[PDB]
């Protein structure tokens with residue numbers, strides 16, 4: 543492990559490194575076990591959930607179709623969203639990630655245990671419903687599980703979908719875009735899936751060059767707030783609000799300088 547995986551020739555992890563070398567269950571155990579010891583991962587997850595709750599429940603971001611871009615094997619980013627969107631389409635470049643996701647959607651006994659995150663989210667929303675009822679709401683809402691490639695003009699290929707009310711992407715674009723032009727390219731590609739006036743919700747690391755799953759290192763585009771804001775505006779969106787938090791992952795997992803969350807509207 544001298545360099546990030548799949549980065550020898552280009553200097554940045556290639557797309558295909560995720561098909562074969564990204565271990566979804568290892569990723570879930572390292573990042574989303576959500577213990578009670580206030581670890582950096584747990585505090586960050588807590589903050590991600592509160593913003594998602596605030597975005598989809600308090601700010602009333604709602605619609606028919608939400609497309610989740612770069613889901614990986616996680617569902618935490620959909621728990622509040624399924625209260626406000628009739629249909630959820632989850633996408634990722636890695637089929638192994640989608641299969642790990644699909645284990646939970648099918649409620650396989652071997653699926654990852656999300657219940658501490660489910661419990662946290664139910665509490666946020668005022669315990670109007672219990673854990674199982676919440677999980678069934680999400681499972682019902684997820685209609686399709688598709689392959690996506692943000693570097694493509696048609697990120698979902700030929701798959702037919704109506705214009706979406708919201709595109710959501712958490713912790714994805716930094717890892718998927720090897721340079722700033724590709725980053726702007728991807729945001730423009732993502733907008734092709736969105737109605738005019740539709741919502742773009744991005745949450746990602748700030749000034750991060752890599753992240754770790756065990757001894758596996760993966761590349762990350764280190765972007766500061768100003769670059770993100772410029773790229774989003776240039777790609778044809780108007781920013782509704784932009785938040786930056788200084789809380790960082792432990793260096794054994796990422797060298798990030800906090801995270802950002804933003805809500806934009808397609809022009």
Ligand SMILES: NC(=O)c1cccc(C#CCN(CC[C@H](N)C(=O)O)C[C@H]2C[C@@H](n3ccc4c(Cl)ncnc43)[C@H](O)[C@@H]2O)c1
Nearest residue numbers: 560612613614635636691692712713716718747750753762
């Ligand atoms: N940058 C950081 O510092 C930092 C900090 C913390 C965690 C992480 C992390 C991660 C792993 N994941 C799951 C994120 C999940 N959404 C969550 O929120 O946990 C990222 C996605 C990207 C996705 N990918 C790759 C190429 C690609 C294309 Cl071309 N088109 C669409 N997707 C693509 C790849 O498959 C993988 O699944 C990074």
